[PDB]
Symmetry: D2
Amino acid sequence: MSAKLISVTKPVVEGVNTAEELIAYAARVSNPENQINNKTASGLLKYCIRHKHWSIFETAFMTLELKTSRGIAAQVIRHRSFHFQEFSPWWATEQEKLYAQSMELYNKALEKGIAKECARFILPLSTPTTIYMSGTIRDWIHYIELRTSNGTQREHIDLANACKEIFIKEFSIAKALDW
Amino acid sequence: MSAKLISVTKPVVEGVNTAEELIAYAARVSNPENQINNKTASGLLKYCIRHKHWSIFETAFMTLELKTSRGIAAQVIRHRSFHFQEFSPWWATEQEKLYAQSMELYNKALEKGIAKECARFILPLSTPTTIYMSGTIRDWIHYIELRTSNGTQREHIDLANACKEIFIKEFSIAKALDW
Amino acid sequence: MSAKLISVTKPVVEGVNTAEELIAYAARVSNPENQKTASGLLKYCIRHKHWSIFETAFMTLELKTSRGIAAQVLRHRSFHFQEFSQTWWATEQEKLYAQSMELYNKALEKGIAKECARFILPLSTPTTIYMSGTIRDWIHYIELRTSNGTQREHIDLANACKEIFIKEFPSIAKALDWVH
Amino acid sequence: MSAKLISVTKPVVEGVNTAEELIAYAARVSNPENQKTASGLLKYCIRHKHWSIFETAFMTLELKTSRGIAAQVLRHRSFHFQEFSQTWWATEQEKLYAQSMELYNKALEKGIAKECARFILPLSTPTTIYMSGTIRDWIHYIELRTSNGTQREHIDLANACKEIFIKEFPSIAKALDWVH
Ligand SMILES: Cc1cc2nc3c(=O)[nH]c(=O)nc-3n(C[C@H](O)[C@H](O)[C@H](O)COP(=O)(O)OP(=O)(O)OC[C@H]3O[C@@H](n4cnc5c(N)ncnc54)[C@H](O)[C@@H]3O)c2cc1C
Ligand SMILES: Cc1cc2nc3c(=O)[nH]c(=O)nc-3n(C[C@H](O)[C@H](O)[C@H](O)COP(=O)(O)OP(=O)(O)OC[C@H]3O[C@@H](n4cnc5c(N)ncnc54)[C@H](O)[C@@H]3O)c2cc1C
Ligand SMILES: Cc1cc2nc3c(=O)[nH]c(=O)nc-3n(C[C@H](O)[C@H](O)[C@H](O)COP(=O)(O)OP(=O)(O)OC[C@H]3O[C@@H](n4cnc5c(N)ncnc54)[C@H](O)[C@@H]3O)c2cc1C
Ligand SMILES: Cc1cc2nc3c(=O)[nH]c(=O)nc-3n(C[C@H](O)[C@H](O)[C@H](O)COP(=O)(O)OP(=O)(O)OC[C@H]3O[C@@H](n4cnc5c(N)ncnc54)[C@H](O)[C@@H]3O)c2cc1C
């Protein structure tokens, strides 16, 4: 039900060490005259966000590994600004009988010579999956804010919050956003 | 296992009647001097394609309704240049026993008060689905060429070919592409 | 300065004759319980971020502006474009421009290629471009570029697009309180 | 004319220390049977259109070019950009430019806003921009813009990017027969 950091933008310019520092640096050198540049990074970035100066948040890219189900991943897949890879600052009773029954038929179909990509189709949407999700920091911002809101279903909320915790760790922007 | 036309680009400029005619017209007025403009539309467009002048094929947008399974739709969903909407020129024996068993549990779970979005999760990937797929003619071109190739699985090939037939009907480009 | 409609989405299915009717149709077969007004349904869809019903429609506009403003418009990367080939301050803008066009003409006359001569043209030089995007993309482009912060010439162009948007999508406009 | 690397993807997981190692890692946990050379695996991935392994890496380059070429580069809409503020034919290009810069300076000195004065600047005027995209997007940008058909100044800029790409992704370059 979780997420881990796989990869993130690392700058190689002098005096810019992290992804967040590049975003703040792009903000500042866009408008060198701006008195706004004299703010803390989180102060500056609050305004960049408020002004819709989104391109500074597209200098950075992060990728996360998500562990979720096939039902939720299909929903996550709909955030088309992201890039995905897939691999091969009573109710809980009847499901378990059916799930065990499906995996039995799955494991035996493979053993009987049926390949993989045909056997896959009998698996339920509750089947766990692992995907990479990659996108700019701009896109992570609006995915997280949306999918941690009331209007999205519980298991997606949990998934997005796992992402939120990693985001907060890597990124002044989490304070700018009042997260 | 099929597709239908739902909607397509209709120009409102004078002497340009169809989506294909706008693409050919954009090609021609991009470079009014070009002796290439004296070709038939399919002759002109063959070259636009060959030269990678892709933006003329992004003046037109088409949308199709696809009937397929949840397994295939999840794969189709990965063509992220497209926009999707979802709604609520022995092996064939064991599957049918399990599928009937899942739908029984699905129908009864709803009848027992479980809602919908929880019951959904027990459904197999073989479950039929209806989606809209919308994108520019450029994107339709490269989706169709890819997903009608050897390297993609049979049921996706059939789906892409249903799309191909509609494309051929609406669009000189089908001849330019040697379809 | 101006905008003209070139092309728009038209549904081919029975009972749905306009791009917006298709948008509304999509929002309807998504309402088990909310059957309020037509524009009220769309407003509700917009408010809950169900964007994809608005990505079923697509519209192209021809914009007439300067190269300088066009470069800014090009930054709205969800859109697809097509380009084609061809006070005292107000007084001295006219002399340089005329003097720039004079040399431009001379160079073309004296054999020099179109793409080399183009480089002497100022950012104020007129250009016409197609801008194509889903209805979703138009909403946030117009929204953004009509609000203070963007420069005057750009505000004017975005207000020209908004006028066309409202004619084609009168029910979304109502949902957004957009008026002529 | 030139390009400089600003930033690139670095994996944080054990055993994978570069963007390309992560790309290669992704292509490996996708090979049940093909275990040929490292660059040979990627070539195979590229040939079967498995693009998404190449969308795990992302790189930013700072480009120095003219406004005219930058407007063309802006058309590669899969990329994200950032802009910042600040023969006889060769003889008369120098006079107009100097004369355009003279008035530009005068206008700024006499109170006129930066955004109004900018419009008298020719398309040849220097600019620096960030260009950020997945490794996939770089491949087809470089591929396209290094080939005959695109104009000289643009070919030169795309060859400057290719040089940096090859330094960072030596194994993809090998897979594509790209050399310095
Ligand atoms: C309540 C709800 C109900 C839904 N119902 C359905 C349904 O019935 N059927 C169906 O098919 N789909 C449905 N969806 C899916 C929805 O239509 C979208 O396709 C998906 O949820 C969000 O993807 P997106 O297109 O915004 O993609 P994203 O990849 O997240 O965003 C696309 C681009 O928009 C930008 N963006 C997003 N928000 C902002 C912002 N605030 N400011 C600036 N840029 C922004 C992003 O940064 C990104 O660059 C529903 C979604 C919601 C939340
Ligand atoms: C054999 C194969 C194996 C795969 N294996 C995996 C896997 O193991 N795991 C996984 O997660 N995914 C896998 N995929 C998915 C793949 O990585 C892509 O994400 C998806 O198949 C194609 O989507 P796309 O990104 O090209 O999207 P699209 O929406 O189809 O295209 C994106 C953009 O690229 C453009 N484009 C595409 N081709 C051209 C062209 N020739 N010329 C100009 N423009 C073009 C389109 O027009 C569009 O604008 C596999 C795909 C293939 C075919
Ligand atoms: C000969 C030439 C003449 C042109 N003339 C005009 C003109 O007169 N007017 C005008 O407006 N425009 C013109 N164009 C511009 C052109 O139409 C494109 O808009 C511009 O080159 C941007 O390319 P792109 O959209 O593919 O952008 P990109 O951002 O480079 O690509 C978009 C997406 O497509 C994918 N993709 C591209 N190629 C492949 C591929 N081979 N396989 C898999 N994926 C791929 C990329 O990875 C990326 O994700 C011309 C282009 C050419 C080269
Ligand atoms: C105040 C201001 C100053 C700027 N200064 C600079 C500068 O100095 N240098 C520089 O390089 N750039 C600057 N920019 C440009 C800016 O950073 C963007 O690159 C440009 O405006 C394009 O916007 P966009 O990427 O959202 O494009 P769009 O194509 O308009 O949007 C991309 C996608 O995001 C979606 N989206 C946008 N808003 C929403 C939303 N509210 N809800 C749901 N979806 C949404 C759209 O529907 C679309 O699908 C500035 C912008 C502003 C307004």
